[PDB]
């Protein structure tokens, strides 16, 4: 009801698995706001943001040759096996070495292509030392069949390291085009695998069936969703904005994480008692806003580049695509209206639709209502295009 509750209350609308900050740290903050420690209150918030931003993710991807490591690594990086920078390493092995692949627009996220353990005379242990297992947040164990012994021995060596690991069963689509002229045809895969684990002295483990081709029609949505949950809270935000924008819910989950960061930021910069109006912009604020808009656009796959490589796929004109959404106009110069008049209208619209988000007479600075507005605009666009991207399919 008062400010301290308003601050932590904002996070109530996000279930445990989608919080960008821990409930313990949140209470420690509300606590300081109540004890009257402006030092530690702005300090706490500030460190939580620094730790959230500076988080570096390192995903190890392992498995036999042709299991699907390259395509998985590319699918998460949101790029085609052909596109520039794609992890087009079928049977590299011109070096039985570990290969790193950064995320195109979201650095801090790095996938590692690990040479199958069966391509080296290294025992389950020696292998992970050379591969530097200690450098990874989690492991993606990929298998085409129903997993081999090697896969289990790796997991065992990994769990003995307190590290996370996930069993991903790829090529399911390539196993459906052999039973058509889905149903329990999946149970099969789900069974062979479960029988392999029950064959290597381990309880039944979670398994994620999926096709790199049909990027979002199986356990893929559940996996990505699970990776985020299992990640230490502070590591969530950076890996979440990097995931592929496959479903509305994925887009939405991204907005929810980003809404939370805008909130933490607004409070860090200090609340004000003057109603937002943007009567005077300021060049430093305009530059910040321009970067925020650019970032969000990248994250939701609606930036300039992404729109270009979307027109050639529809044989339409870039400008034609841009007209389909609203995010690209915001900073598009016009003789008819100033960027100030426009931004001013944005704030007014926003606050009339959402209120000020805080108790009476307390408001975030103008720049943050704007950042929320841009966030809504950009997520809607993503859902717009994505939607149109689904009509023109192959079925």
Binding residues (CB under 6 A) for ligand GNP: these are: 63, 65-71, 89-92, 116, 170-171, 173-174, 211-213
| C-alpha span between 78 and 309 (Å, rounded) | 13
174 appears as a binding residue in the annotation: yes
* 171 annotated to bind ligand: yes
For the CB of residue 165, give the shortest distance to ligand GNP in the complex, in Å: 17
| Cα–Cα distance measured from residue 15 to residue 32, given in angstroms and rounded to the nearest whole number | 24
Pick between residue 32 and residue 69 the one whose CB is nearest to ligand GNP. Answer: 69
**Backbone phi and psi for residue 109, each to the nearest 5 degrees, phi listed first:** -115, 115
Q: How far is the CB of 170 from ligand GNP (least distance, A)?
A: 4
- Residue 8 near residue 30, CB atoms below 8 Å: yes
Q: Which residues, including other chains, have CB under 8 Å from residue 146's CB and lie 6 or more apart? A: 169, 189, 192, 193, 195, 196
Query: How far is 185 from 233, CA to CA, in rounded Å?
Result: 37
Nearest distance, CB of residue 148 and ligand GNP, angstroms: 13
E-state strands within the chain: 57-62, 99-102, 109-113, 138-143, 164-169, 207-209
Specify the pairing of strand 164-169 against strand 207-209.
parallel
Q: How many CB atoms lie within 10 A of CB 271?
A: 17
Question: Shortest distance, CB of residue 289 to ligand GNP, whole angstroms?
Answer: 41
- Least Å distance between CB 85 and ligand GNP? 15
Closer by beta carbon to ligand GNP, 142 or else 325: 142
Q: Does 277 count as an annotated binding residue?
A: no
Q: Is 148 annotated as a binding residue?
A: no
User: Minimal distance in Å, beta carbon 281 to ligand GNP?
Assistant: 49
Nearer to ligand GNP, 182 or 213 (CB): 213
Output 223 or 375, the one with its CB closest to ligand GNP. Answer: 223
Start-end of H helices in 57-184: 69-76, 124-130, 149-159
Short-list 353, 393, 392, CA closest to 373: 353
C-beta closer to ligand GNP: residue 192 or 320: 192
Task: Tell which residue, 111, 129, 112, 109, has the closest CA to residue 120.
Answer: 129
Minimum distance between the CB of residue 152 and ligand GNP, rounded to whole angstroms?
A: 18
Task: Confirm or deny that 173 is annotated as ligand binding.
Answer: yes
Rounded Cα gap, residues 260 and 45, in angstroms: 12
Question: 66 a known binding residue?
Answer: yes
Residue 71 marked ligand-binding: yes
The answer on whether 43 is annotated among ligand-binding residues is no
Whichever of 165 and 295 has its CB closer to ligand GNP, that residue is: 165
Q: Could you give the CA distance from residue 3 to residue 272 in angstroms, rounded to a whole number? A: 12
For ligand GNP, the closer CB: 46 or 89: 89
- Known binding residue 89? Answer is yes
Residue with tokens 């099969």: 188
Closest CA to 111 of 170, 58, 166: 58
Residues at the binding site are 66, 68-71, 89-90, 171, 173-174, 212
Residues at the binding site for GDP are 66, 68-71, 89-90, 171, 173-174, 212
């Amino acid at each position: 009801n008062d400010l301290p509750s308003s601050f932590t209350g904002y996070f109530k609308k996000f279930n445990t698995g989608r919080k960008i900050i821990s409930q313990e740290i949140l209470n420690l903050i509300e606590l300081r706001m109540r004890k009257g420690n402006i030092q530690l209150t702005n300090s706490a918030i500030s460190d939580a943001l620094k730790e959230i931003d500076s988080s570096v993710l390192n995903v190890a991807v392992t498995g036999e040759t042709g299991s699907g490591k390259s395509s998985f690594i590319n699918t998460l990086r949101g790029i085609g096996n052909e596109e520039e920078g794609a992890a087009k390493t079928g049977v590299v092995e011109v070096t039985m070495e570990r290969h790193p692949y950064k995320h195109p627009n979201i650095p801090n996220v790095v996938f590692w292509d690990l040479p199958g353990i069966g391509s080296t005379n290294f025992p389950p242990d020696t292998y992970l030392e050379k591969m530097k297992f200690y450098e990874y947040d989690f492991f993606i164990i990929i298998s085409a069949t129903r997993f081999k012994k090697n896969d289990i021995d790796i997991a065992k060596a990994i769990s003995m390291m307190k590290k996370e690991f996930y069993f991903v069963r790829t090529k399911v689509d390539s196993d459906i085009t052999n039973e058509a002229d889905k149903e329990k045809v999946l149970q099969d895969i789900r069974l062979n695998c479960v029988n392999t684990f029950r064959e290597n002295g381990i309880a039944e483990p979670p398994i994620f069936l999926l096709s790199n081709k049909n990027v979002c029609h199986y356990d893929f949505p559940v996996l990505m969703d699970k990776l985020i949950s299992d990640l230490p809270i502070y590591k969530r935000h950076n890996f979440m904005v990097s995931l592929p924008n496959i479903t509305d819910s994925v887009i939405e989950k991204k907005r929810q994480f980003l809404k939370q960061r805008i909130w933490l930021e607004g409070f860090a910069a200090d609340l004000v008692n003057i109603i937002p109006s943007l009567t005077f912009l300021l060049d430093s604020d305009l530059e910040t806003l321009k970067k925020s808009m650019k970032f969000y656009r990248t994250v939701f796959g609606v930036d300039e580049t992404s729109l270009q490589r979307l027109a050639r796929d529809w044989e339409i004109e870039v400008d034609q695509v841009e007209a389909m959404i609203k995010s690209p106009a915001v900073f598009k110069p016009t003789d008819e209206e100033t960027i100030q008049e426009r931004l001013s209208r944005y704030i007014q619209e926003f606050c009339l639709a959402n209120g000020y988000l805080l108790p009476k007479n307390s408001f975030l600075k103008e720049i943050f209502y704007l950042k929320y507005y841009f966030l809504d605009m950009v997520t809607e666009d993503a859902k717009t295009l994505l939607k149109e991207i689904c009509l023109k399919l192959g079925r």
